[PDB]
PDB file of C-alpha atoms in Angstrom:
ATOM      1  CA  UNK A   1     177.847 110.573  21.978  1.00  0.00           C
ATOM      2  CA  UNK A   2     177.624 110.247  18.133  1.00  0.00           C
ATOM      3  CA  UNK A   3     178.040 107.252  15.687  1.00  0.00           C
ATOM      4  CA  UNK A   4     178.416 107.306  11.805  1.00  0.00           C
ATOM      5  CA  UNK A   5     178.023 104.528   9.117  1.00  0.00           C
ATOM      6  CA  UNK A   6     177.970 104.834   5.256  1.00  0.00           C
ATOM      7  CA  UNK A   7     178.509 108.667   5.690  1.00  0.00           C
ATOM      8  CA  UNK A   8     175.102 108.846   7.540  1.00  0.00           C
ATOM      9  CA  UNK A   9     174.139 109.107  11.285  1.00  0.00           C
ATOM     10  CA  UNK A  10     173.629 105.701  13.051  1.00  0.00           C
ATOM     11  CA  UNK A  11     171.020 106.183  15.847  1.00  0.00           C
ATOM     12  CA  UNK A  12     170.562 103.851  18.902  1.00  0.00           C
ATOM     13  CA  UNK A  13     166.924 102.496  19.214  1.00  0.00           C
ATOM     14  CA  UNK A  14     164.909 100.271  21.696  1.00  0.00           C
ATOM     15  CA  UNK A  15     164.580 100.392  25.512  1.00  0.00           C
ATOM     16  CA  UNK A  16     166.817 102.028  28.256  1.00  0.00           C
ATOM     17  CA  UNK A  17     169.689  99.681  29.264  1.00  0.00           C
ATOM     18  CA  UNK A  18     170.024  99.408  33.115  1.00  0.00           C
ATOM     19  CA  UNK A  19     172.950  98.205  35.383  1.00  0.00           C
ATOM     20  CA  UNK A  20     171.631  94.647  36.173  1.00  0.00           C
ATOM     21  CA  UNK A  21     172.673  93.542  39.712  1.00  0.00           C
ATOM     22  CA  UNK A  22     172.316  90.076  41.393  1.00  0.00           C
ATOM     23  CA  UNK A  23     169.955  91.658  44.024  1.00  0.00           C
ATOM     24  CA  UNK A  24     167.392  93.101  41.501  1.00  0.00           C
ATOM     25  CA  UNK A  25     166.088  89.602  40.424  1.00  0.00           C
ATOM     26  CA  UNK A  26     166.391  87.727  43.859  1.00  0.00           C
ATOM     27  CA  UNK A  27     164.332  90.515  45.626  1.00  0.00           C
ATOM     28  CA  UNK A  28     161.433  89.320  43.322  1.00  0.00           C
ATOM     29  CA  UNK A  29     162.405  85.744  44.502  1.00  0.00           C
ATOM     30  CA  UNK A  30     162.246  87.109  48.130  1.00  0.00           C
ATOM     31  CA  UNK A  31     158.826  88.632  47.054  1.00  0.00           C
ATOM     32  CA  UNK A  32     157.913  85.292  45.299  1.00  0.00           C
ATOM     33  CA  UNK A  33     154.660  87.130  44.321  1.00  0.00           C
ATOM     34  CA  UNK A  34     153.422  86.059  47.837  1.00  0.00           C
ATOM     35  CA  UNK A  35     149.871  87.241  46.885  1.00  0.00           C
ATOM     36  CA  UNK A  36     147.915  83.946  47.585  1.00  0.00           C
ATOM     37  CA  UNK A  37     146.755  82.861  44.062  1.00  0.00           C
ATOM     38  CA  UNK A  38     143.014  83.119  45.041  1.00  0.00           C
ATOM     39  CA  UNK A  39     140.541  84.816  42.521  1.00  0.00           C
ATOM     40  CA  UNK A  40     139.042  87.478  44.863  1.00  0.00           C
ATOM     41  CA  UNK A  41     136.359  89.385  42.772  1.00  0.00           C
ATOM     42  CA  UNK A  42     135.359  92.802  44.322  1.00  0.00           C
ATOM     43  CA  UNK A  43     131.921  94.353  43.562  1.00  0.00           C
ATOM     44  CA  UNK A  44     130.711  97.751  42.109  1.00  0.00           C
ATOM     45  CA  UNK A  45     127.591  99.513  43.544  1.00  0.00           C
ATOM     46  CA  UNK A  46     125.545 101.247  40.735  1.00  0.00           C
ATOM     47  CA  UNK A  47     124.756 104.995  41.425  1.00  0.00           C
ATOM     48  CA  UNK A  48     121.667 106.740  39.892  1.00  0.00           C
ATOM     49  CA  UNK A  49     121.801 110.469  38.755  1.00  0.00           C
ATOM     50  CA  UNK A  50     119.596 113.032  36.923  1.00  0.00           C
ATOM     51  CA  UNK A  51     119.359 111.318  33.458  1.00  0.00           C
ATOM     52  CA  UNK A  52     118.638 107.657  34.709  1.00  0.00           C
ATOM     53  CA  UNK A  53     118.755 106.455  30.983  1.00  0.00           C
ATOM     54  CA  UNK A  54     122.593 105.848  31.272  1.00  0.00           C
ATOM     55  CA  UNK A  55     124.201 103.896  34.231  1.00  0.00           C
ATOM     56  CA  UNK A  56     127.249 104.904  36.347  1.00  0.00           C
ATOM     57  CA  UNK A  57     129.313 102.460  38.537  1.00  0.00           C
ATOM     58  CA  UNK A  58     131.263 103.564  41.664  1.00  0.00           C
ATOM     59  CA  UNK A  59     134.302 101.736  43.294  1.00  0.00           C
ATOM     60  CA  UNK A  60     132.879 101.185  46.852  1.00  0.00           C
TER      61      UNK A  60
ATOM     62  CA  UNK B   1     121.895  72.011  40.653  1.00  0.00           C
ATOM     63  CA  UNK B   2     118.639  73.150  38.840  1.00  0.00           C
ATOM     64  CA  UNK B   3     118.008  75.841  41.543  1.00  0.00           C
ATOM     65  CA  UNK B   4     121.762  76.826  41.633  1.00  0.00           C
ATOM     66  CA  UNK B   5     121.732  77.158  37.765  1.00  0.00           C
ATOM     67  CA  UNK B   6     118.615  79.509  37.545  1.00  0.00           C
ATOM     68  CA  UNK B   7     120.133  81.575  40.490  1.00  0.00           C
ATOM     69  CA  UNK B   8     123.407  82.170  38.455  1.00  0.00           C
ATOM     70  CA  UNK B   9     121.844  83.005  34.976  1.00  0.00           C
ATOM     71  CA  UNK B  10     119.193  85.291  36.643  1.00  0.00           C
ATOM     72  CA  UNK B  11     122.071  87.167  38.530  1.00  0.00           C
ATOM     73  CA  UNK B  12     124.169  87.562  35.256  1.00  0.00           C
ATOM     74  CA  UNK B  13     121.415  88.526  32.679  1.00  0.00           C
ATOM     75  CA  UNK B  14     119.930  91.102  35.209  1.00  0.00           C
ATOM     76  CA  UNK B  15     123.391  92.848  35.616  1.00  0.00           C
ATOM     77  CA  UNK B  16     124.192  92.708  31.803  1.00  0.00           C
ATOM     78  CA  UNK B  17     120.815  94.537  31.425  1.00  0.00           C
ATOM     79  CA  UNK B  18     122.047  97.638  33.373  1.00  0.00           C
ATOM     80  CA  UNK B  19     125.701  97.299  32.100  1.00  0.00           C
ATOM     81  CA  UNK B  20     124.547  97.737  28.445  1.00  0.00           C
ATOM     82  CA  UNK B  21     123.101 101.203  29.426  1.00  0.00           C
ATOM     83  CA  UNK B  22     126.487 102.946  30.275  1.00  0.00           C
ATOM     84  CA  UNK B  23     128.478 105.233  27.845  1.00  0.00           C
ATOM     85  CA  UNK B  24     131.955 104.053  26.692  1.00  0.00           C
ATOM     86  CA  UNK B  25     133.450 107.386  27.973  1.00  0.00           C
ATOM     87  CA  UNK B  26     133.586 106.257  31.704  1.00  0.00           C
ATOM     88  CA  UNK B  27     135.999 104.517  34.178  1.00  0.00           C
ATOM     89  CA  UNK B  28     133.980 101.186  34.682  1.00  0.00           C
ATOM     90  CA  UNK B  29     132.336 100.566  31.240  1.00  0.00           C
ATOM     91  CA  UNK B  30     131.279  97.722  28.811  1.00  0.00           C
ATOM     92  CA  UNK B  31     134.916  96.717  27.933  1.00  0.00           C
ATOM     93  CA  UNK B  32     136.790  97.250  31.289  1.00  0.00           C
ATOM     94  CA  UNK B  33     134.398  96.055  34.154  1.00  0.00           C
ATOM     95  CA  UNK B  34     136.181  92.608  34.555  1.00  0.00           C
ATOM     96  CA  UNK B  35     139.856  93.882  34.840  1.00  0.00           C
ATOM     97  CA  UNK B  36     139.318  96.258  37.896  1.00  0.00           C
ATOM     98  CA  UNK B  37     137.126  93.711  39.843  1.00  0.00           C
ATOM     99  CA  UNK B  38     139.594  90.631  39.358  1.00  0.00           C
ATOM    100  CA  UNK B  39     142.439  90.694  41.998  1.00  0.00           C
ATOM    101  CA  UNK B  40     144.251  87.468  40.877  1.00  0.00           C
ATOM    102  CA  UNK B  41     146.358  86.153  37.910  1.00  0.00           C
ATOM    103  CA  UNK B  42     144.100  84.222  35.433  1.00  0.00           C
ATOM    104  CA  UNK B  43     145.433  83.281  31.920  1.00  0.00           C
ATOM    105  CA  UNK B  44     142.556  85.168  30.144  1.00  0.00           C
ATOM    106  CA  UNK B  45     139.405  87.025  31.499  1.00  0.00           C
ATOM    107  CA  UNK B  46     136.805  84.538  30.059  1.00  0.00           C
ATOM    108  CA  UNK B  47     134.472  81.657  31.103  1.00  0.00           C
ATOM    109  CA  UNK B  48     133.690  81.601  34.912  1.00  0.00           C
ATOM    110  CA  UNK B  49     135.642  84.828  35.822  1.00  0.00           C
ATOM    111  CA  UNK B  50     133.181  87.081  33.795  1.00  0.00           C
TER     112      UNK B  50
ATOM    113  CA  UNK C   1     154.207 131.183   1.941  1.00  0.00           C
ATOM    114  CA  UNK C   2     158.011 130.293   2.250  1.00  0.00           C
ATOM    115  CA  UNK C   3     157.141 127.872   5.183  1.00  0.00           C
ATOM    116  CA  UNK C   4     154.912 125.607   2.926  1.00  0.00           C
ATOM    117  CA  UNK C   5     157.088 125.204  -0.306  1.00  0.00           C
ATOM    118  CA  UNK C   6     159.337 122.252   0.715  1.00  0.00           C
ATOM    119  CA  UNK C   7     157.437 119.027   1.806  1.00  0.00           C
ATOM    120  CA  UNK C   8     157.700 118.390   5.584  1.00  0.00           C
ATOM    121  CA  UNK C   9     158.473 114.744   6.617  1.00  0.00           C
ATOM    122  CA  UNK C  10     156.035 112.858   8.968  1.00  0.00           C
ATOM    123  CA  UNK C  11     158.048 110.233  11.060  1.00  0.00           C
ATOM    124  CA  UNK C  12     155.679 107.184  11.285  1.00  0.00           C
ATOM    125  CA  UNK C  13     157.049 104.497  13.703  1.00  0.00           C
ATOM    126  CA  UNK C  14     157.568 100.826  12.438  1.00  0.00           C
ATOM    127  CA  UNK C  15     154.471  98.548  13.086  1.00  0.00           C
ATOM    128  CA  UNK C  16     155.472  95.641  15.472  1.00  0.00           C
ATOM    129  CA  UNK C  17     153.362  93.763  18.133  1.00  0.00           C
ATOM    130  CA  UNK C  18     153.609  90.294  19.876  1.00  0.00           C
ATOM    131  CA  UNK C  19     150.305  90.105  21.861  1.00  0.00           C
ATOM    132  CA  UNK C  20     148.742  87.510  19.392  1.00  0.00           C
ATOM    133  CA  UNK C  21     151.582  84.985  19.883  1.00  0.00           C
ATOM    134  CA  UNK C  22     151.969  85.310  23.700  1.00  0.00           C
ATOM    135  CA  UNK C  23     148.540  86.372  25.183  1.00  0.00           C
ATOM    136  CA  UNK C  24     149.776  85.324  28.724  1.00  0.00           C
ATOM    137  CA  UNK C  25     151.870  88.613  28.953  1.00  0.00           C
ATOM    138  CA  UNK C  26     148.617  90.778  28.604  1.00  0.00           C
ATOM    139  CA  UNK C  27     146.374  89.976  31.662  1.00  0.00           C
ATOM    140  CA  UNK C  28     143.846  91.785  33.990  1.00  0.00           C
ATOM    141  CA  UNK C  29     146.511  93.736  36.025  1.00  0.00           C
ATOM    142  CA  UNK C  30     148.337  96.030  33.477  1.00  0.00           C
ATOM    143  CA  UNK C  31     151.393  98.301  34.176  1.00  0.00           C
ATOM    144  CA  UNK C  32     150.869 102.101  33.637  1.00  0.00           C
ATOM    145  CA  UNK C  33     153.145 105.056  34.677  1.00  0.00           C
ATOM    146  CA  UNK C  34     150.305 107.704  34.905  1.00  0.00           C
ATOM    147  CA  UNK C  35     146.860 107.000  36.519  1.00  0.00           C
ATOM    148  CA  UNK C  36     145.201 109.249  33.847  1.00  0.00           C
ATOM    149  CA  UNK C  37     146.290 106.850  30.993  1.00  0.00           C
ATOM    150  CA  UNK C  38     142.794 106.149  29.480  1.00  0.00           C
ATOM    151  CA  UNK C  39     141.576 109.850  29.373  1.00  0.00           C
ATOM    152  CA  UNK C  40     142.569 110.625  25.665  1.00  0.00           C
ATOM    153  CA  UNK C  41     140.554 107.604  24.203  1.00  0.00           C
ATOM    154  CA  UNK C  42     137.535 108.272  26.534  1.00  0.00           C
ATOM    155  CA  UNK C  43     137.605 111.941  25.282  1.00  0.00           C
ATOM    156  CA  UNK C  44     137.753 111.032  21.507  1.00  0.00           C
ATOM    157  CA  UNK C  45     135.064 108.217  21.625  1.00  0.00           C
ATOM    158  CA  UNK C  46     132.656 110.724  23.375  1.00  0.00           C
ATOM    159  CA  UNK C  47     133.494 113.884  21.290  1.00  0.00           C
ATOM    160  CA  UNK C  48     135.204 113.037  17.914  1.00  0.00           C
ATOM    161  CA  UNK C  49     134.754 116.535  16.303  1.00  0.00           C
ATOM    162  CA  UNK C  50     136.648 118.244  19.278  1.00  0.00           C
TER     163      UNK C  50
END
């Protein structure tokens, strides 16, 4: 595919166009974002290593 | 409330002590310690969330 | 020396951003394709001369 304007190439820019279906939006309505809107803050256990001057946090 | 207040500021200022002593080149660092912990949808990570 | 006579063109993308207007769109749970999406910055901030 090629397009020309003013004897110069006209290039298509922006995002990738998809084939929007009725189902693609109403599955997110079926989902509703059913994650109970409750601010659950999870902790980080500090872990000490050779230097000790600098700190290092782990996930569990 | 006086006892609940000192309990909260003592908990925060102790942890900000040993958060200031981590290098920026790390997973959980100075800038990105709030985002990974929070599992909700607040407007902006400020105030009581931090 | 034939390579370096004619000036090569550097394609700089147009500067546009709408985070300042709508800060609700940027929150604590960001979308990323790769899980190693913060490695390049963490590398530069640690070792700039590399």
